[PDB]
Design a protein around this ligand. Structure first.
Ligand SMILES: Nc1ncnc2c1ncn2[C@@H]1O[C@H](COP(=O)(O)OP(=O)(O)O)[C@@H](O)[C@H]1O
Ligand SMILES: Nc1ncnc2c1ncn2[C@@H]1O[C@H](COP(=O)(O)OP(=O)(O)O)[C@@H](O)[C@H]1O
Ligand SMILES: Nc1ncnc2c1ncn2[C@@H]1O[C@H](COP(=O)(O)OP(=O)(O)O)[C@@H](O)[C@H]1O
Lengths: 201, 245, 439, 71, 447, 426, 55, 41
């Protein structure tokens, strides 16, 4: 390689030939938002005009419609997201984060032109659950740790507008990744598959 | 390079919306095993370790630990102790930030960025615009991260659970941006063998519970003893001869 | 069934040097067997490394291919243990395209001096009872609030500060969370949920296994030992917010003025007692890969008071120094070879060979008959020792495939017919001499 | 109870070896003799690099070639 | 009644030249037989004596000397003796010949970094600063609106002032997240702001906050001070080439990116020379031209040697010291050409050569003694004589290197000192270059 | 006395290139001696440079080591002086890691051809007597010279400038009227009470000053290369500068030359130790010397018939015949005894040391036995042993002492043949 | 209103997936050493589209 | 070159040797501005 020393191209391929097989649940709430209904308590707390115990979000999918109940901090985020009734949205059940996908396809005729791509109605229930058995090479862990991809800082945006480069990953990063995959293999969270490296010529 | 930056900032917004659509349904082929769709060449979300999936999955977020603005040393064991009974226990393999005092090098010299004086009324507006930062869009883009993040940051005081800033304002280095140094108050101990000996005696006597008087010759020394005794929050009183009856 | 990341490799059976407290080598102990002269010498330099008073001392381990140079190097790595830094470099690894040779060696040296720091801090570790956050109707942004925490014994209220409020709300903290707050750092961390308050609840706000409520007093001490090399102290100081460079390795050819300044401030932290300094080992395996440019760096690097104890290993005779015409011992210039002590290893007897094979079979969980050991001992003298060490697992797997419980002599004769010794492959390379390329 | 001089005190103590209360002050705490100053890097500016009005008017390819650059 | 004391701070580590303390001259310039931790070499130590007069004269530019002689003859030790004899003030820049081969900048320019680093400069920097608790922070605005001017109220134990300041200082205060009640320091020459933390007057306003509080500053708010800076000309050359200074977005950004070296233009050194000649003519400065020492010079490229011709002639350049340990060697990068000391004859005319002798056995004993009382170890007379005996057969470095291994064996069997049997036993474990080359040449069929 | 950065160096004694109007060199003047052939030749080259009318021309200064081939090339630079570009490089200085070897010569060729222009500026200079301001804004200023006073109505862009830069009554200031920039020179001596102090300007306040200015042709390339060019001029970020930009700038300057708005000032490139260049770099000099913007270049060498770098071919000077055919070769010559002693006197003047006339004789013998340069190095060390001795003057036994402390190359080589097996490699 | 056919070569899909704005490098030339993990993902995806009949 | 491959420097120079020849009318207006009046609506 021109980017990186000969021995590091071997060391990266020595790390491609070992795989984690790591299994985790995904759970999410998703659907067309039918209504946003904050629910008050008729008694306020002392000195304040009115008080909310929870927000109801009505969500629809091809299988049915359900009123989800959520803590009132959600309403702040549902005006960071520019949400309106008949959007389709999702909420990460493991995390409490909420996201907007777009206006639901049932409304794709209320103007002859409008500046959004319309989203087809989600199918299955309003609450979705599955297990997935994900797999990653230790080399994928080496690169994902060596060059993070979340953009909420100038070092990451600068590092992602700049040309991507192979870099001589330290024996310390290899060390820390070894120390933590042991932490999960001991707990039965992660399987390990010692693989094969094949070099021809 | 400004339009590069905005088209990047929008692409991250599009990544979370794409990942949900890409991972929670399988309606065969779009007209019975025919026709691709908008965004179908964007496969950077299909990797298990890609940021949208890595954030949606609760667990992989812990195997990609070296986030770009934290001082992570790696993992270590830790010990924790009760104040009563002196009983203690060990925490196995947890993340650690590096200590708050390894950042101690400095440039010997720090020059002003060079500037081109020019002898023309139209020309001097151009270097002025460069000294301001050449548009409010590009200035907000580096300083606060994107023009939406700047418009939001101007009102984030009004929001209960804010997001992090994206800009240069996302960063906070351990000393701040300036290299200028005020001596750390621990130096009072480590400059005097008498004051170092005194600190081990006061920790001895405070652990035993005894009440103590300290005598010194010089009011300038009593200032040094007081600044130490304040810094270690020992409780303190002084009665130099300049104190009123 | 279970299988950790580290597994059975070429030295995993070695666990020390097997010396007594009088520094004499036991015939077989801690996985080392035979090889008395070099094990004795390794013991002395190990004791010199634990003493640590003296800088830039060095050793070259020499002798035949496959005679435990690297075995003794790993033996002293395990005898020295995890608390003192040992850096293994194969000599090729310094030929970077990112940085020059003298940089790559200066990094390998300074990665091998540890600075050890006790971080002692006060933590609050509790279960959240309730939180109040107060936010102005518009205003300048003078947020205020209160938080309450519990243990199985005690509970209390905290009046919150302005930077605490953003650090709490950043991590979505809520009633029923168990949290561990560092008072000096101002940083939260989340341990899970307690089983109690999570019943007064909504469509899901999180999904994780619960954690038992914290016990004893709500406020408690923590202690951590960091082991920070001089190299990562230099890298953190090379550019502000540079902390990712410790992993990515992307910082090339660091400014000399950083090293000059860190050499002073690391001495000050010793004189303050603020940090320990723990000089360790650099093991440049296969050092005959270094160019004469790099050896001439070692001549004058290995005389700094910050130099680690440096161990070479090599197997070469009179051969020319890499990058030059000149023949010399070990492939090293006498300019360097004059400076370091040579530890001489020796070939193996029947007794040593059989005893090495027996301790290897123990670590690989293999039963073999004394007859199979007799033929494998013959094979380990008719052929180099590593080939015999390579028939053991193959013979155990052929034994397993025919459902035997113990390796028999004909399991080894089977495997010997199946996987070739170099001396036998280089013989068959004479019948096909027209068919292989570029003889 | 006896005390060594610190590594910084020994320098100033030797300077006094090369007036007994002036001697006690350094031995007691070196901040009685000289306080540790607030250090900062040396700050410098060059001349501004002077560009002629003629070069600024007629001398950049961004300007004098703009009609060609459009194509 | 009781007497108490403590001391457990570890020493500096002992090193392969830490016994060298100076040239050990008398006032005539003759060498004392053994002084300042050295022995022998009088015909070289007297010459190094003339060179420490030459450095301390400041008069010359680009004078160069070559220390030549076999391995183990003390050439690096004498170059360290020169460095010790100059003391801390005059810069001595150590270098090794193979350091020129950077991957970031041309070999020919890496030498100019060292040449510009071996010239030192001292400056009276009369800084001025504002510090105190921020009691007020109020910006002021101008027409299309935007910020234009700033009010900051500061308080200290000796007063308070309501300062009027540049809007770049407001941008800098906002960057550091400064608020009312913070204790801050502002360097008025440089626009730099340091936030220390909230004042101790507020120290219990919360039960929890991330802060560490600080005491109210003493003296007046606005004050100037006579800082003395020691700096090299290289530190002026580089700081202007990739500036972290100032407060703008560009300098704040350029500080974070990978700090690559760059091939500094001669025109920038022209500006630095014009600048520092003004600081000397104002009487602000003192110049301290020092030494560049290039150990192992014999593997600089013919590129580097042919550049050294122009460098050593420059009326700017520092005094230079080289070392070499080579015979009639082939010059690297030439393949054809053999010359004394591995150095081209074209450069060899430009250096005053100092010739270094080999040691007699009676000097070996004296270095070994001086070394043992530096390692912190005690030795009996027949034991010290056996290290001298070994030193006749082997080499000086090897007889020194046997010391601490023998001291470990001595205390491993409970003795206070090295006895001859501990040296004699150690010689059976640790082979040398000569004895290893014998067994390795005999067994040569197997390696 | 104090020492500035420039101190006594290996060419400091040369203060010119001593010549009569006839271009004949007198025996010793302007700090250099002898070389009557080479210095008459260097006089003719110095006139070709100063005339400027002939473009792309070369001289090679060649001869035995130590014969003044760098001396006449350095004296020629002092005689040429400011107001004509002169640039020096060593031959191994073009081998950049960051830039093409061929482009590095293209920069060296175009640092050394100047563009010169003149511009007229309305500059106001004076002591500020009084300044006044109001809350848009209005205000009033007064300025004084030794010969007049005025009051002035200020405009807003001046008001913001005067107030930003804290201009106070009793300063002496220069105002760039075209630009609003203020330079403050000091305070008036009559207001030095309650630092730098200075007298008021003479003549009238507002002078239409003419400024002549010069930019190297390369320095126009770097200004054109980047969103701000001039940073890359100092920081060295100039690299592989796009050749179509040069194709435009050379043609743009070629019309300024003839519309008369600028004039081009041909300078000098001194590419010292020219035998370091590869045959690849000589192939560039073969052709870069044949265009109107090419300077005159001086090249210096001390090599016999030698292998040219990048090949197995041997040729005179270490230069291919390819390039020697472009150029004129001036030969230095080995010094006689008279010239040798006279150089040693001049070095003793430049180092400021006295020595005995028989000390100059034995040092001249040493010089003739050691090709001069080693004897020049003994001068300083002899004076330092004399200073150790508290002597007034360097004596013969100070020189004979120092001659035994520091070896020349011949005695060093001879001693290296005694211990021939103790040093490494042979 | 129509369906249309595009032909696009496999290298362009490899470059587009190499970094966030990879398509600029199709013209700029300023790309190289594409991670092998991307190329083998594109084999799997392009084989999958061919089995799904979509390409 | 040290920024591009050898065959690229050939290809750039092969592309410098082919010219387009484009005709357009130059149209300059210059003078003191006497008024400005701006006149979706
Ligand atoms: N003395 C020993 N005791 C135990 N195992 C040994 C010993 N010497 C060598 N080995 C083992 O035999 C093999 C050869 O040793 P190795 O260290 O690889 O040889 P070398 O580095 O000298 O070429 C390895 O598997 C090693 O673990
Ligand atoms: N004259 C001397 N006086 C004191 N120590 C010396 C002397 N000569 C050599 N030594 C010591 O012996 C060793 C060899 O000298 P060194 O300077 O390293 O030799 P070299 O010039 O060949 O590299 C070092 O430990 C050095 O300090
Ligand atoms: N004509 C001269 N007059 C005065 N000094 C001279 C003269 N010629 C040579 N020198 C001195 O002798 C040195 C040797 O000549 P130089 O030009 O440097 O030779 P070279 O370039 O071949 O090495 C000069 O650097 C200068 O110090």
């Amino acid at each position: 390689s021109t980017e990186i020393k000969k021995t590091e191209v071997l060391m990266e391929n020595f790390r491609r030939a070992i795989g984690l097989r790591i299994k985790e649940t995904k759970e999410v709430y998703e659907g067309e938002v039918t209504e946003l209904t904050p629910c008050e308590t008729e008694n306020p707390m002392g000195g304040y005009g009115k008080t909310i115990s929870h927000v109801i979000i009505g969500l629809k999918t091809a299988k049915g419609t359900k009123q989800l109940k959520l803590d009132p901090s959600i309403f702040e985020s549902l005006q960071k997201e520019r949400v309106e009734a008949g959007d389709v949205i999702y909420i990460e059940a493991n995390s409490g984060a909420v996201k907007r996908q777009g206006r639901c396809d049932t409304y794709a005729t209320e103007f002859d032109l409008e500046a959004e791509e319309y989203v087809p109605l989600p199918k299955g229930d309003v609450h979705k659950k599955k297990e997935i058995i994900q797999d990653v090479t230790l080399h994928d862990l080496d690169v994902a740790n060596a060059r993070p991809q979340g953009g909420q800082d100038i070092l990451s945006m600068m590092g992602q507008l700049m040309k991507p480069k192979k870099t001589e990953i330290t024996d310390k990063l290899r060390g820390e990744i070894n120390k933590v995959v042991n932490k999960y293999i001991d707990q039965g969270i992660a399987e390990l598959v010692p693989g094969v490296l094949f070099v021809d010529e | 390079l400004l339009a590069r930056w905005l088209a990047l900032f929008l692409s991250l917004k599009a990544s979370y919306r794409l990942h949900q659509l890409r991972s929670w349904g399988a309606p065969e082929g779009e007209s019975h095993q025919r026709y691709l769709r908008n965004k179908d060449f964007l496969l950077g979300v299909n990797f298990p370790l890609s940021f949208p999936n890595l954030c949606s999955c609760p667990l992989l977020k812990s195997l990609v630990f070296s986030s770009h603005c934290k001082a992570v040393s790696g993992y270590s064991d830790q010990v924790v102790h009760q104040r009563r009974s002196a009983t203690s226990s060990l925490r196995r393999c947890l993340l650690t930030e590096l200590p708050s005092f390894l950042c101690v090098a400095s440039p010997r010299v720090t020059a002003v960025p060079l500037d081109s004086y020019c002898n023309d009324r139209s020309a001097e507006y151009e270097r002025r615009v460069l000294k301001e930062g050449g548009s409010l869009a590009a200035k907000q883009c580096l300083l606060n991260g994107a023009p939406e993040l700047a418009a939001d940051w101007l009102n984030r005081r009004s929001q209960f659970f804010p997001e992090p800033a994206g800009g240069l304002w996302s960063i906070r280095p351990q000393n701040g941006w300036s290299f200028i140094r005020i001596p750390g108050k621990e130096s009072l101990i480590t400059d005097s063998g008498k004051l170092y000996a005194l600190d081990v005696l006061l920790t001895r006597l405070k652990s035993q519970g005894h009440r103590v008087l300290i005598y010194s010759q010089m009011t300038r020394m009593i200032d040094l003893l007081e600044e130490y005794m304040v810094y270690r929050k020992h409780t303190y009183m002084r009665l130099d001869g300049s104190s009123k009856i | 069934d279970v299988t950790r990341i580290e597994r059975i490799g070429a030295h995993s059976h070695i666990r020390g040097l097997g010396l007594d407290d009088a520094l004499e080598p036991r015939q077989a102990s801690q996985g080392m067997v035979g090889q008395l002269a070099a094990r004795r010498a390794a013991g002395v330099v190990l004791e010199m490394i634990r003493e640590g008073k003296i800088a830039g001392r060095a050793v070259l381990i020499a002798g035949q291919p496959g005679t435990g140079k690297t075995a003794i190097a790993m033996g002293m790595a395990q005898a020295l243990g995890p608390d003192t830094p040992f850096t293994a470099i194969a000599g090729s690894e310094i030929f970077s395209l990112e940085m020059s040779k003298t940089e790559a060696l200066t990094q390998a040296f300074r990665r091998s001096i540890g600075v050890r720091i006790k971080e002692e801090t006060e933590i609050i570790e509790g279960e959240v009872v309730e939180i109040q956050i107060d936010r102005p109707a518009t205003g300048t942004g003078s947020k205020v609030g209160k938080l309450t925490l519990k243990t199985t014994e005690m509970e209390t209220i905290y009046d919150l500060g302005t930077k605490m409020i953003e650090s709490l709300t950043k991590d979505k903290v809520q009633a029923g969370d168990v949290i561990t707050i560092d008072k000096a750092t101002g940083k939260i961390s989340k341990l899970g949920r307690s089983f109690t308050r999570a019943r007064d609840y909504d469509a899901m706000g999180s999904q994780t296994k619960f954690v038992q409520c914290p016990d004893g007093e709500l406020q408690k001490r923590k202690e951590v030992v960091h082991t920070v090399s001089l190299h990562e102290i230099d890298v953190i100081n090379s550019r502000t917010q540079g902390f990712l460079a410790l992993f990515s390795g992307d910082t090339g050819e660091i400014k000399s003025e950083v090293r000059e300044q860190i050499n002073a401030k690391v001495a000050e932290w010793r004189e303050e007692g603020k940090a320990e300094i723990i000089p360790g080992v650099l093991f440049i395996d296969e050092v005959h890969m270094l160019d004469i440019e790099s050896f001439s760096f070692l001549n004058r690097a290995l005389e700094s008071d910050m130099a680690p104890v440096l161990i070479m290993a090599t197997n070469r005779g009179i051969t020319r120094i890499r990058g030059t015409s000149y023949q010399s011992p070990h492939g090293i210039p006498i300019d360097l070879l004059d400076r370091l002590l040579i530890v001489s290893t020796t070939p193996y007897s029947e007794k040593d060979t059989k005893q090495i094979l027996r301790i290897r079979c123990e670590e690989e969980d293999v039963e073999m008959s004394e007859d199979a050991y007799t033929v494998l001992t013959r094979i380990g003298l008719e052929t180099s020792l590593r080939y015999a060490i390579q028939l053991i697992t193959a013979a155990s797997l052929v034994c397993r495939k025919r459902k035997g419980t113990e390796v028999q002599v004909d399991d080894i004769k089977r495997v010997y017919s199946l996987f070739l010794d170099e001396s036998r492959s280089t013989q068959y390379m004479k019948e096909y001499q027209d068919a292989f390329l570029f003889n | 109870m006896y005390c060594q001089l610190t590594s910084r005190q020994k320098l100033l103590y030797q300077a006094l070896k090369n007036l007994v209360m002036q001697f006690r002050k350094v031995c007691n705490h070196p901040e009685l003799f000289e306080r540790q100053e607030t250090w900062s890097p040396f700050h410098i500016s060059l001349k501004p690099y002077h560009i002629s009005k003629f070069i600024y008017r007629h001398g950049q390819i961004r300007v004098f070639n703009h009609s060609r650059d459009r194509w | 009644k009781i007497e108490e004391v403590k001391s457990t701070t570890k020493t500096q580590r002992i090193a392969s030249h830490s016994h060298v303390k100076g040239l050990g001259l008398d006032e005539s310039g003759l060498a004392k037989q053994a002084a300042s931790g050295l022995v022998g070499q009088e015909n070289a130590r007297e010459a190094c004596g003339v060179i420490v007069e030459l450095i301390k004269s400041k008069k010359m530019a680009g004078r160069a000397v070559l220390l030549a002689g076999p391995p183990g003859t003390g050439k690096t030790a004498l170059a360290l003796a020169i460095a010790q004899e100059l003391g801390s003030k005059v810069p001595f820049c150590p270098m090794v010949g193979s350091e020129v081969y950077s991957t970031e900048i041309k070999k020919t320019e890496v030498l100019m970094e060292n040449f510009r680093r071996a010239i030192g400069l001292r400056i009276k920097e009369t800084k001025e600063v504002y510090e105190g608790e921020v009691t007020e922070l109020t910006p002021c605005e101008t027409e299309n609106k935007t910020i234009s001017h700033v009010i900051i109220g500061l308080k200290t134990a000796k007063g308070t002032k309501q300062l009027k300041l540049d809007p770049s200082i407001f941008e800098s205060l906002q960057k550091e997240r400064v608020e009312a009640g913070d204790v801050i320091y502002i360097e008025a020459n440089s626009g730099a702001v340091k936030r220390q933390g909230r004042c101790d007057t507020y120290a219990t306003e919360f039960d929890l906050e991330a802060e560490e509080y600080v005491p109210l500053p003493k003296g007046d708010v606005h004050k100037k001070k006579e800082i003395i800076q020691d700096v090299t000309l290289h530190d002026l050359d580089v700081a202007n080439a990739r500036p972290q200074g100032g407060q703008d977005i560009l300098s704040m950004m350029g500080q974070l990116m990978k700090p690559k070296k760059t091939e500094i233009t001669d025109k920038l050194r022209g500006e630095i020379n014009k600048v520092v000649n003004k600081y000397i003519d104002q009487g602000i400065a003192e110049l301290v031209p020092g030494v560049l020492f290039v150990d192992e010079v014999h593997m600089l490229d013919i590129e580097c040697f042919t550049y050294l011709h122009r460098a050593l002639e420059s009326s700017i350049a520092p005094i230079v010291i080289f070392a070499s340990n080579r015979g009639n060697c082939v010059i690297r990068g030439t393949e054809d050409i053999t010359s004394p000391h591995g150095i081209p004859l074209d450069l060899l005319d430009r250096v005053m050569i100092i010739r270094t002798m080999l040691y007699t056995p009676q000097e070996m004993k004296q270095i070994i003694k001086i070394r043992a009382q530096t390692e912190g170890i005690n030795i009996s007379e027949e034991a010290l004589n056996h290290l001298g005996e070994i030193g006749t057969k082997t080499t000086l470095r090897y007889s020194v290197q046997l010391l601490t291994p023998a001291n470990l064996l001595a205390k491993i069997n409970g003795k206070d000192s090295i006895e001859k049997e501990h040296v004699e036993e150690i010689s059976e474990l640790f082979y040398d270059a000569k004895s290893s080359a014998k067994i390795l040449a005999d067994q040569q069929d197997k390696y």
